[PDB]
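In response to the reviewer comment on reproducibility (Comment 2.3), we provide here a single inverse folding case reported in full, input and output, so that an independent group could reproduce the run without further information from us. The structure tokens appear first.
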């Protein structure tokens, strides 16, 4: 037997990797950067956050950066959670903007 449907664990691996467009909204209002990362869903938010910074590679202080979900109006602060766990997939637009610390 052995089926990939029974309550996970022996079902889904990571084959489902979809490209997510993240629009980087720079907190200075200088420019927006459209970065496309192909994620496997099992990628946790914190990892995506790091990849954005690496993609632009800009010499400015990202005092406090995170993801802004446009279609839900919410800040991704569940970095310990995955994309699939949060519920954010390629069907949604994702904005990367610094919450600019306190």
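Designed residues, in position order:
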């Amino acid at each position: 037997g052995i089926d990939p449907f029974t309550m996970l664990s022996s079902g889904d691996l990571t084959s489902a990797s979809w490209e997510l467009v993240v629009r980087v909204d720079h907190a200075n209002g200088e420019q927006q950067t459209e970065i496309t990362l192909r994620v496997s869903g099992d990628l946790h938010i914190g990892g995506v956050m790091l990849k954005l910074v690496e993609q632009m590679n800009i010499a400015q202080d990202w005092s406090d950066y995170a993801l802004w979900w446009e279609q839900k109006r919410c800040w991704l602060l569940k970095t310990h959670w995955t994309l699939d766990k949060c519920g954010v997939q390629a069907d949604a637009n994702l904005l990367f903007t610094p919450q600019h610390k306190m």
